[PDB]
Design a protein around this ligand. Structure first.
Ligand SMILES: *[C@@H]1O[C@H](CO)[C@@H](O[C@@H]2O[C@H](CO)[C@@H](O[C@@H]3O[C@H](CO[C@H]4O[C@H](CO)[C@@H](O)[C@H](O)[C@@H]4O)[C@@H](O)[C@H](O[C@H]4O[C@H](CO[C@@H]5O[C@H](CO)[C@@H](O)[C@H](O)[C@@H]5O)[C@@H](O)[C@H](O)[C@@H]4O)[C@@H]3O)[C@H](O)[C@H]2NC(C)=O)[C@H](O)[C@H]1NC(C)=O
Ligand code: NAG
Ligand code: NAG
Ligand code: SLC
Ligand code: ZN
Length: 596
């Protein structure tokens, strides 16, 4: 009770100390991600080991405080965050091995190089950008399969043994914190003992819509490739979906769009024609934020960021990332930026993270993070939703001669759906798979097909060629080799529509009883009211539980699929009718593609 006065001073000092200590770990991590070398790996891992040691002392020292006895919700909440040790709870030697494993994987992934399909001499092709360019633009189904195979063999199957040890150590670490496994560890970040159920329920409401999109896309792909490549009743061969992991299908919109003779938005060629640069694209992102009365990017951002792929022979992690350094105004992005419409969305996504950093940088160290991981992921996407509208793309002069009729509107809704709906069953399987390994629910002899079973069951997709337990495929996705929780993205795609809906209403850009203000053509650019709400929420960091953060934004406390259903309602109506009209088969048979 009266001990709380001394405890407050303890927290003030320790918070500031953790910030300064993390800053050093973060610089070392940045160094590695920007320049992968044996020497920089050593540094990175050794620094983190040192910080883990300090963390162990900190968790120990908290037991000197009767902190659960305290009056202040705020002090109790801060102390609680400090007891949460993570991997740091592992014994010295164990933590060292974990770190060496994580970087062995993350590095292997970033170092992947395949040979040219047309030329077995030219073997310096990397995922970003050589391979991803083919996956997104080639319509030679056999070339597509070739690249799919080479990549998965190298980014997935090579790190099997490493991944095995990683699950062991994650599990051990989780138990040392008295969680059942890493699943329950990850899920703790959401402060809600029913969070899993809530998601199952939401997915359940959304699933039928996904089913229809799946059916229609399969139908259209059959006309393009033939029935020899695409069956009517089988899962879709994933390598035809424009994307290496088939998480989003917007890259093949030119062949599966509802009205092929009406405008389909693809501003990449205009960006190039108008001489866009990575630097331009970021400056535009900056403009969007400042136009909403949010915070200008600081000078440290422009000085220290990496916004193009470096042209020395160096290895590096090209997967887009945003870094907070826990001082004042030292925030950065690393992105291997290309001049395309999707990349413009990515830029806004990453600047969403940066804005979050800046908004809560005045918070105590333990509150300098998302309300929950999903929130951090949503921020950028809320703006990207606006940026993607014809309304906005016409404004910045990238969309020309556009006629917004009923048919064009459907093409746009479908395009967004190939991004926003398609993704959801992907996001789920990502952690569903890992959760099941963490919880020890799959025998090691079953690990790979247990992956593809989930991809089948939820997404209705399957590998181009036959896989087995001789292959190991999950780490072919970045966030799996790099040990990054994925449920964040699912939470994001649900709640980003709650944010966007309410942002649009506050901007006077959405009225449901008004045909001239439709949610799917809302641009919040320049809205002070919208930015205001963002500020109220983002400036909180993790100071209160996420319910209180959402309440701050728009007065609501519940994660809901209502808003994302509201957005796509007009597409549902059209697509249900269209599938009936064309006698489109819905659903899929079990996949013959992973042998046990
Ligand atoms: C993971 O979950 C674990 C639960 O399984 C948990 O492990 C337990 O942590 C306990 C620490 O809180 C620890 O409890 C201590 O046990 C000592 C004796 O245990 C020994 O013999 C056991 C066999 O019988 C062995 O298995 C053990 O290895 C030990 O060798 C006790 O002597 C000790 O006591 C002291 O501390 C209490 C604390 O008092 C609290 O604070 C104030 C005092 O300042 C009190 O006023 C207040 O009321 C409050 O109770 C004192 O009361 C007492 O006088 C002694 O000073 C203590 O009970 C336990 O041993 C340990 N393991 C097991 C198997 O139980 C981990 O902590 C969890 N990890 C995380 C991250 O939470
Ligand atoms: C990468 O790190 C190495 C040492 O590991 C160093 O010699 C080199 O200068 C760095 N390269 C770049 C481009 O910074
Ligand atoms: C900008 O933000 C300030 C405080 O954050 C607020 O008072 C002001 O209304 C905002 N600007 C506009 C034009 O609304
Ligand atoms: C570029 C990012 C932001 Se860290 C990313 O990883 N994204 C953007 C949305 C989900 C996802 C992905 O790669 O799968
Ligand atoms: Zn992100």
């Amino acid at each position: 009770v009266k001990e709380e006065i001394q405890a407050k001073e303890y927290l003030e000092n320790l918070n500031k100390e953790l910030a300064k200590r993390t800053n050093v770990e973060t610089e070392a991590a940045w160094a590695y991600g920007s320049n992968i070398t044996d020497e920089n790996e050593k540094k990175k891992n050794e620094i983190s080991a040192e910080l883990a040691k300090f963390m162990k002392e900190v968790a120990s020292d908290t037991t000197k405080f009767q902190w659960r006895s305290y009056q202040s919700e705020d002090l109790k909440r801060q102390f609680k965050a400090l007891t949460k040790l993570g991997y740091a709870a592992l014994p010295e030697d164990d933590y060292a091995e974990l770190l060496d494993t994580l970087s062995a994987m993350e590095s292997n992934f970033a170092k992947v190089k395949v040979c040219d399909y047309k030329d077995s001499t030219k073997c310096d092709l990397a995922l970003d950008p050589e391979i991803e360019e083919v996956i997104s633009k080639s319509r030679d189904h056999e070339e597509l399969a070739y690249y799919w195979r080479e990549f998965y063999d190298k980014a997935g199957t090579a790190v099997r043994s490493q991944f095995e040890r990683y699950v062991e150590l994650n599990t051990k670490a989780a138990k040392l914190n008295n969680f059942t496994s890493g699943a329950e560890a990850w899920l703790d970040e959401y402060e809600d003992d029913t969070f899993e159920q809530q998601l199952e329920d939401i997915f359940a409401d959304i699933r039928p819509l996904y089913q229809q999109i799946h059916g229609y896309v399969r139908f259209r792909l059959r006309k393009h490739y033939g029935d020899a490549v695409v069956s009517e009743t089988g899962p879709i061969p994933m390598h035809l979906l424009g994307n290496m992991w088939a998480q989003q299908w917007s890259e093949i919109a030119d062949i599966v769009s509802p009205f092929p003779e009406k405008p389909l938005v693809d501003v990449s060629a205009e960006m190039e024609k108008q001489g866009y640069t990575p630097l331009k694209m970021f400056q535009m992102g900056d403009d969007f934020f400042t136009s909403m009365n949010l915070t200008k990017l600081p000078q440290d951002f422009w000085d220290k960021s990496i916004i193009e792929k470096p042209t020395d022979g160096r290895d590096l992690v090209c997967h887009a990332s945003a870094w907070d350094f826990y001082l004042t105004d030292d925030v950065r992005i690393k992105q291997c930026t290309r001049v395309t419409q999707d990349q413009l969305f990515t830029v806004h996504h990453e600047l969403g993270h940066i804005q979050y950093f800046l908004q809560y940088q005045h918070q105590p160290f333990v509150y300098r993070t998302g309300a929950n991981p999903g929130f951090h992921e949503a921020v950028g996407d809320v703006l990207s939703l606006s940026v993607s509208t014809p309304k906005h793309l016409e404004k910045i002069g990238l969309l020309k001669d556009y006629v917004r009729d009923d048919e064009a509107r459907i093409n746009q809704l479908f395009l967004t759906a190939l991004d926003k709906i398609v993704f959801l069953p992907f996001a789920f399987t990502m952690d569903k798979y890992r959760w099941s390994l963490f919880r020890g629910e799959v025998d090691k002899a079953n690990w790979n097909c247990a992956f593809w079973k989930l991809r089948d069951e939820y997404s209705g997709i399957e590998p181009p060629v036959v896989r087995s337990e001789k292959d190991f495929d999950a780490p072919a996705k970045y966030h799996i080799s790099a040990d990054v929780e994925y449920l964040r993205y699912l939470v994001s795609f649900i709640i980003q529509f709650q944010f966007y809906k309410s942002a649009c209403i506050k901007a006077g850009q959405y009225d449901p009883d008004n045909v001239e203000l439709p949610l799917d053509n809302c641009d919040i650019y320049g809205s002070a009211a919208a930015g205001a709400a963002f500020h109220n929420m983002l400036s909180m960091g993790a100071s209160k539980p996420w319910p209180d953060a959402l309440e701050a934004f728009n007065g609501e406390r519940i994660m809901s699929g209502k808003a994302i259903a509201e957005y796509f309602e007009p597409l549902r109506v059209w697509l249900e009718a269209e599938n009936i009209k064309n006698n489109v088969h819905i659903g899929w048979t079990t996949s013959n593609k992973c042998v046990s």
